[PDB]
């Protein structure tokens, strides 16, 4: 099932525990969560934002040190902007927290993103058109889950169209046998230069490995189980973005707020990419891993 389909409609929904469970369960299986009526309203003072030529240099906040990137402008534009982004992570979160009480205090904040550019009009590695899981080279994750929100926020009523792929151990099979260990040394010397933040660990090598070489396997991206879902212009979905095969083909418009949660927070670590990775490979992946006696 690789969409599940809900009907909350409110940032602040109470929800039973029946769906609690649905979502958690469909979540952690690598489901995208749909929520076609969970609209994120815009202030009229914002919609002067639905303008592609904000973007600078995907424009960021980071609402842990309330600051706002990828954009320059007035003060008082630059304001508004990130109070809109604000609000999104802070909606986003009262909701996550409202659908995933599992999670508890678990659930990390990371960056909220407003994509404003067309998608349709858009290297190998980083054209989104083409399945993947998220793993990003200057950012790795030490093991942890990769949850993003997002909403469609576009104001002419188009949709923002997806692809969903097959699931993730599947992914990892297909691309085994085209893994490769890392250069010894050279993950040290990218941590040395600031290349990457922190350390890059063997699962965020493994896992960079799965992004790159999946989008390189034409074969593979022409042929794998795929469905191809138009998600409308007022809803949310929620997704972990390192588990679930996605690519982005068209659409204007979209916000989308990045969480971070540590494998041993899970219902089913076992089915995190970082335990079937180590599964698959018979190794620790993450040096920094705590030990459990
Ligand atoms: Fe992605």
Redesign the pocket.
């Given at each position: 099932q690789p969409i599940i389909q809900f009907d909350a409609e409110s940032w602040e929904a109470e929800f039973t525990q029946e769906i609690q469970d649905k979502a958690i369960e469909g979540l952690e299986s690598g489901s995208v969560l749909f929520f076609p009526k969970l609209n994120f309203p815009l202030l009229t003072e914002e919609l002067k934002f639905l303008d592609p030529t904000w973007v600078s240099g995907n424009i960021s906040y980071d609402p842990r040190s309330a600051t706002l990137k990828g954009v320059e402008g007035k003060s008082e534009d630059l304001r508004l902007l990130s109070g809109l982004l604000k609000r999104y992570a802070e909606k986003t979160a009262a909701f996550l927290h409202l659908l995933f009480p599992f999670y508890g205090s678990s659930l990390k904040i990371a960056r909220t993103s407003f994509r404003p550019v067309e998608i349709s009009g858009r290297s190998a590695r980083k054209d989104?058109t083409r399945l993947?899981?998220?793993a990003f080279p200057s950012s790795p994750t030490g093991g942890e889950r990769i949850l993003?929100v997002f909403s469609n926020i576009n104001p002419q009523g188009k949709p923002r169209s997806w692809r969903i792929g097959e699931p993730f151990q599947n992914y990892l099979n297909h691309l085994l046998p085209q893994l490769s260990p890392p250069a010894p040394g050279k993950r040290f010397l990218l941590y040395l230069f600031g290349i990457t933040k922190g350390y890059r660990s063997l699962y965020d090598h493994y896992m960079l490995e799965l992004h790159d070489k999946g989008k390189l396997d034409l074969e593979y991206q022409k042929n794998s189980p795929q469905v191809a879902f138009d998600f409308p212009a007022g809803s949310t979905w929620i997704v972990f973005?390192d588990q679930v095969l996605?690519?982005?083909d068209k659409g204007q418009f979209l916000l989308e707020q990045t969480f971070h949660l540590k494998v041993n927070a899970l219902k089913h670590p076992e089915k995190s990419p970082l335990k079937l990775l180590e599964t698959a490979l018979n190794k620790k992946l993450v040096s920094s891993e705590s030990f459990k006696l």
């Open positions: 989104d993947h899981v998220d993003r973005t996605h690519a982005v």
